[PDB]
Ligand binder design. Structure first.
Ligand SMILES: [Mg+2]
Ligand SMILES: [Mg+2]
Lengths: 261, 42, 255, 252
DNA sequence: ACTGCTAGAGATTTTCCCG
DNA sequence: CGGGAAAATCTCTAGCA
DNA sequence: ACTGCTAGAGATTTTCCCG
DNA sequence: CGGGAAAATCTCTAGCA
């Protein structure tokens, strides 16, 4: 292929032909043509085809403003449940945002808030509010709304319901509260056939109850598993398996080659 | 040198109840490369 | 860098020495130390060897020394012509992985044959006075000690060349001393095994290479290559000319 | 090709090895290496301290070859004549490069010569004549002889005198041919194989005696053990322990 | 070092109910 | 065990940024 | 009575080649 | 019939409007 490699490179600096073109024309193994393309800086123009996944921890909220009929609507969503909070604010200011976030934190457990990099969420007043209530702030990558896919999807859902009930109310703020009500309690679906209100209550109660249950379980139950190794702490056992926490690492081991002390 | 109360309280301070309780909860989850949520797991 | 390497850099700023400390005491790979001394404006500066000559008893003796361990490779050469020095340098290069050689500018080393020897084997050579001629003084003192050795051994060898070799071996192995009384062989072997492990360590250090091409934010144009720093699920962190950026994996390409 | 691949090809022309270097060191894909070796006309495709020695002839010239059993690291040099004295000189030159301990020969007259025994003595090298008593090196010595002959068969086009071609082949077989277990060139493996010193390091270690009161007495102790948060040192006629904060260790 | 999601419309497969 | 209908699960899109 | 598609990057499965 | 690598097929995205 020594002859063809030099020619395909010259043709690539003119044409930037993809690897199949070089492999067909200059009789090349697919790996060599691919290497020619790969080392071209002008031919690197496409990302990888995948999507990430947002954090859906029980304490994470996603926030964003949305605009409707010239007014600013500050919308928050609890990621795990789909529950929502929303108000019309007078302006997209850091002060209005600090106030909204303080109200949210005083009504619901809020461990982390995830927003874009708009001026209102990045402001020092919002920081001071988040420091006071103990809220971690996660800032999305700039110009990447998929980072806040949940609240963007929920802003669509809320705009649709506001459109549905707009002529039942004079002012926009009231339509926003009617739509919030409707979404939280008058729309069922999702993981447990729930409405979002039912679902957030279940998520938060489940968090509380499982925390308590397993804390008591670990207080009373005390063992040490040796597998394969060191004194691994026991997490669970059953059906020919054991769960252990060895140096902050959780691994599923079969019952064989595993002895409990 | 412990009072009868101290020994009583220590003694009184089962697990299968709490374990079945924990095993009653449903878990919906995803694998790190699949957008669809996986059905209720135990 | 690592906290140890940052501490070594701060110790350099405190003490104006780069290679003599972090390459030895801090176990830094030689490539990083070379990069640091290159960046260091205060630093004007296992594969190092030196070659020299001596004229004991009217005969020409050419001696090589591994600087880091007091090893000896020597041979009585029939003549000072560069042709025979080329053959002997071929021997040194074949027997051990020799990377750089420090000699003088003389025609005994600048001849065409020596240049061909370096070209074939892959050895770099220095011609002239080294920046630290105290090493040359040390090897000359070793030459004098070999000469005293010879003044003793020549009671045992019918041919002075053979006594030259006998001395080479005595100093390699029997004359153990320094630090903890170690022979030149022991230090040589330790150094070269450490060198193998440092090649492996340099590989694993440089692992954590990757060119990243990425779509910048709001920009239609793709840019790169950037250095990859960290790779999560969904996003990466990239170094594009001392400018740390975070890019979703949809908008990046890692080669 | 890439600058690295072109450099690898030039290194092949310099060293007559294709797969053992670019497939391993240069991370070349196996298909490209296979294509290169196909195009390459020159590519036809125990007890450490135990070495073999042997005599070979080529084009009317005599070559003495030293091998290592434990990794096939091969030393060699052209000999002026088959006489025993030259053999003794070569074995001498061997002694100073590695701790040779026992060698095996073919019981030849030039090797049974007395001077060979003399050299083996004053250097401290033992001779175990006959054939080696392990059923690996017995054919391995001849196999590596054939390997050296084959390497010279390609080297000879770049050297008109055997005295240089032999060293060319030796460097190739020592480093530029990497294989075996994981692709380790013989030189690397022998580095590993070669790798009382630590005992002699601490023989003369005396200690300035102190105690938990943190005194400045600095008694004439002898260091017995170090580590695990304290020391173990003898105090004249008795034994005690001292934390590392005290008990300075010095040479006697 | 961070990350698309949600809800509805129609298609497909599974389950349950009388045999 | 067999259909047939009712329920549950699957595929796929717009629209939010 | 008209209508999403294309090309590349990485993952997964299939096929072929020496055994 | 078995691996292992090389080739072919599959999944999925941006960007065009
Ligand atoms: Mg926004
Ligand atoms: Mg918005």
């Amino acid at each position: 292929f020594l002859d063809g490699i030099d020619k395909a490179q010259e043709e690539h600096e003119k044409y930037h032909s993809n690897w199949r073109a070089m492999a067909s024309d200059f009789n090349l193994p697919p790996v060599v043509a691919k290497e020619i393309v790969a080392s071209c800086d002008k031919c690197q123009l496409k990302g990888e085809a995948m999507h990430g996944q947002v954090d859906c921890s029980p304490g994470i909220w996603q926030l964003d403003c949305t605009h409707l009929e010239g007014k600013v609507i500050l919308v928050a969503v609890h990621v795990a449940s789909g529950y929502i909070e929303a108000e019309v604010i007078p302006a997209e200011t850091g002060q209005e945002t600090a106030y909204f976030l303080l109200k949210l934190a005083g009504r619901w457990p809020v461990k982390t808030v995830h927003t874009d990099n708009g001026s209102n969420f990045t402001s020092t007043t919002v920081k001071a509010a988040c420091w006071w209530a103990g809220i971690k702030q996660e800032f999305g990558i700039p110009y990447n709304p998929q980072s806040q896919g949940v609240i963007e999807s929920m802003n669509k859902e809320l705009k649709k319901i506001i459109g549905q009930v707009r002529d039942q109310a004079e002012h926009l703020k009231t339509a926003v509260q009617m739509a919030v009500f409707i979404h939280n309690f008058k729309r069922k679906g999702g993981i447990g056939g729930y409405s979002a209100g039912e679902r957030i209550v279940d998520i938060i109660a489940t968090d509380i109850q499982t925390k308590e249950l397993q804390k008591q379980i670990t207080k009373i139950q005390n063992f040490r598993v040796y597998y394969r190794k060191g004194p691994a702490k026991l997490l669970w056992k059953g059906e020919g398996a054991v769960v252990i926490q060895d140096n902050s690492d959780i691994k599923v081991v079969p019952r064989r080659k595993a002895k409990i002390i | 040198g412990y009072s009868a109360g101290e020994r009583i309280v220590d003694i009184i301070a089962e697990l299968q109840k709490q374990i079945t309780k924990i095993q009653n909860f449903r878990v919906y989850y995803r694998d790190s490369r699949d957008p669809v949520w996986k059905g209720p797991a135990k």
